Design a protein around this nucleic acid. Structure first.
Lengths: 56, 117, 110, 120
RNA sequence: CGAAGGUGUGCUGUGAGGCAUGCUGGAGGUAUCAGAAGUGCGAAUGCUGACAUAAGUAACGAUAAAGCGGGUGAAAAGCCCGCUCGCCGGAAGACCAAGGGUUCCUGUCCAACGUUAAUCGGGGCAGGGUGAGUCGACCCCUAAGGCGAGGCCGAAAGGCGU
RNA sequence: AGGACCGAACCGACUAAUGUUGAAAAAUUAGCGGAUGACUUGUGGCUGGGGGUGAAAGGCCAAUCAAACCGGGAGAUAGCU
RNA sequence: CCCGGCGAGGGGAGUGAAAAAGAACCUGAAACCGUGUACGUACAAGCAGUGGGAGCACGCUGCGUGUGACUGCGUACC
RNA sequence: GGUUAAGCGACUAAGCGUACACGGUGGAUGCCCUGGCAGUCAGAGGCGAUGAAGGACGUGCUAAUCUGCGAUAAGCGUCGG
């Protein structure tokens, strides 16, 4: 249920070795607007694959 | 005459932790663990001041045996022959000669063989 | 010419902000600003403000470089934690620590 | 065990699921563009496209089926009067899902669902 | 022209120690020989404060339920407006006594508090709001009981009682 | 008529599951007993610790009961740890 | 003056002997948590040290500081 | 020099260890005294129905608290400094 011995800094770090975050590999550039966006996601201005399909 | 203990306690703890430098984890960081690590290190150092002499005698004897068997005689026969010939060269210098001057070791072996024969 | 930016007493544990600080250490500011924008973490909103401040500080206090800047140092230090009481079953009070962190970013062209 | 099964539970019971998709289909037919979660849009496809397909042949029986599945006479009227004639030459694919980032409150993936020719 | 205190290094004695000097500190320290002790901590399931581990793990408090559009906003799953949906309805609705005390309404702010975010709030700040011959209290009457001039009783205190 | 019967409110607490760092220092759900009486309930009053009260279980007397709690004798005593 | 939400927080400028005295303010120890550099470590079994000891890195003119592959011995304190 | 075979074989660090440098946290140490403790030498040994000890409420250019004060309310008269 509970420890008998305090685990160490070392074992803490080894357990945390798989906690690293994977940064975004590469952002896609819009062909019309040239904005950077996540692939298959629309741009902040509302573009996607060169077309402005967003009301705003 | 109230006496505060901060300065002297810090001095003693820093002394022990300074001796505990290089150890692993709490042995190097925490005073309670470090103190019985430092005492254990001193006990081992006392013991190994004695054990060092045994280990080096063992090493010299092994090297002398190797060189003697190279020259065609056992270690026991070689030392007995040196004793009969009254050669008082110790085993440290015999091992040094075995490593660094093989001609001299052959000379010593022939002296021991003459002593035995 | 190093330029510092500091956010002290951020409402986020150092362990939480360090996962994001690990993503932009030794990296071009333009590249570091893109990574932060697309990482679904609350630490990244907090770390993108210190980085942006540091660029602005490099613009205004130091010489106008911007394009030649890199994240030369970044670290997170534990800050003062706040102590609160969480009641539990059968009348036992637990102490919850609300942790804080100081974020430091250092940018230089060299 | 989910071998060859269809439909997402979406952490709801079946009654809540039916009611939610009824409301959401009404909203999509009304506005022609709605922001929702990605899996919700994936299921709204299956809810809304059969309804528009039903809105091709204009008959009282189809009107009553649509009203049974929608419970909104304005939505039924808009379907049979506008979206039937609009999509009458299209073989399915009346809708379009565009992924649009994440929700601030809970980091849920977000998608716009649109009717393929809305012109707004 | 750098004291105590902190932190390193070098030397030094058999040991507790001593000495010197770099950095920090910014004002006191104190030889020698005597004198006096709250005079030496690693443990007492010791006392107090800080900080770890378990671990970014369990949990986020009734399984009545939510979806979308617009608005404000630095930012909206949660705030506002609207439409649909769902729950209670001898209650999860309305009103009193008791208890509380400003939680009431408006404007503003989001550090902390709210088991998340928060533009919202019973949160912070400021200003406003409680109008009685007829409602209630007070008031006049008394019940159980209390207190009780004289009085009876009891070492004192005090008990009982007209 | 009834210390009658079935059964809501109300008063209780027989069984099971849950929960046991609980939503809760005794509860939740499903069932369960009484339910015009030796009933239940509000407001106020009285009984005080070798005492009270007790359809009596050493039960209850402010989450404390084979002698409440607070303060004192008091740094009781401890041939024990 | 600049970043930011007319925020919190910070970077400059200025005061001051000192801001490494900025109000979470004299000094600022330890536990505890990090960033950087040097060596070591992914075929290796145990109170983690001690004796021997290569290599490597950095100072000095074959040593000094750091790490410590491999190896003998070695089951904490009260 | 070319091909093959055999033998040997440096450089990896997801993380971790040790050393050093620089930081965070934290609040010990040093220095300080407007607070205490124990006394000595002198006082005084009481206040109150002429309403006390102690309080509530109020009192300012005042929003609150402390101090003083009391509807003559951070105060009024007189006499000296």
């Amino acid at each position: 249920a509970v420890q008998q011995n305090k685990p160490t800094r070392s074992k803490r770090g080894m357990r945390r070795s798989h906690d690293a975050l994977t940064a975004v590999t590469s952002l896609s550039v819009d062909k019309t607007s040239g904005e950077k966006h996540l692939r298959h996601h629309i741009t902040a201005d509302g573009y996607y694959r060169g077309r402005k399909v967003i009301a705003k | 005459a109230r006496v505060k203990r901060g300065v002297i306690a810090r001095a003693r703890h820093k002394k022990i932790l300074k001796q505990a430098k290089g150890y692993y984890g709490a042995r190097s960081r925490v005073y309670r663990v470090a103190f019985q690590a430092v005492i254990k290190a001193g006990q081992y150092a006392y013991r190994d001041r004695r054990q060092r002499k045994r280990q080096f005698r063992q090493l010299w004897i092994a090297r002398i045996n190797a060189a003697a068997r190279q020259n065609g005689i056992s270690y026991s026969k070689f030392i007995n022959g040196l004793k009969k010939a009254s050669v008082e060269i110790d085993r440290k210098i015999l091992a040094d000669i075995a490593v660094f001057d093989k001609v001299a070791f052959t000379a010593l072996v022939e002296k021991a063989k003459a002593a035995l024969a | 010419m190093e330029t510092i930016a500091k956010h002290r007493h951020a409402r986020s544990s150092a362990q939480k902000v360090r996962l994001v600080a690990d993503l932009i250490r030794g990296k071009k500011v333009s590249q570091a600003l893109d990574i932060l924008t697309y990482t679904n973490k609350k630490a990244a909103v907090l770390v993108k403000k210190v980085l942006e401040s540091a660029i602005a500080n490099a613009e205004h206090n130091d010489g106008a470089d911007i394009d030649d800047l890199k994240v030369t140092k970044i670290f997170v230090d534990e800050g003062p934690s706040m102590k609160r009481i969480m009641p539990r079953a059968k009348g036992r009070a637990d102490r919850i620590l609300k942790r804080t962190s100081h974020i430091t970013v250092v940018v230089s062209d060299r | 065990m989910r071998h060859r099964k269809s439909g997402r539970q979406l952490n709801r019971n079946s009654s809540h699921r039916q009611a939610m998709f009824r409301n959401m289909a009404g909203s999509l037919v009304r506005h022609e563009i709605i922001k929702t979660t990605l899996p919700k849009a994936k299921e709204l496809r299956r809810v809304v496209e059969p309804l528009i397909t039903l809105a091709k042949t204009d008959s009282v029986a189809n009107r009553r089926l649509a009203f049974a599945r929608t419970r909104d006479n304005e939505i039924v009227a808009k379907l049979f009067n506008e979206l039937g004639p609009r999509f009458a030459s299209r073989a399915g694919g009346y809708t379009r899902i565009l992924k649009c980032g994440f929700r601030a409150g809970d980091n849920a993936p977000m998608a716009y669902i649109e009717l393929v020719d809305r012109s707004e």
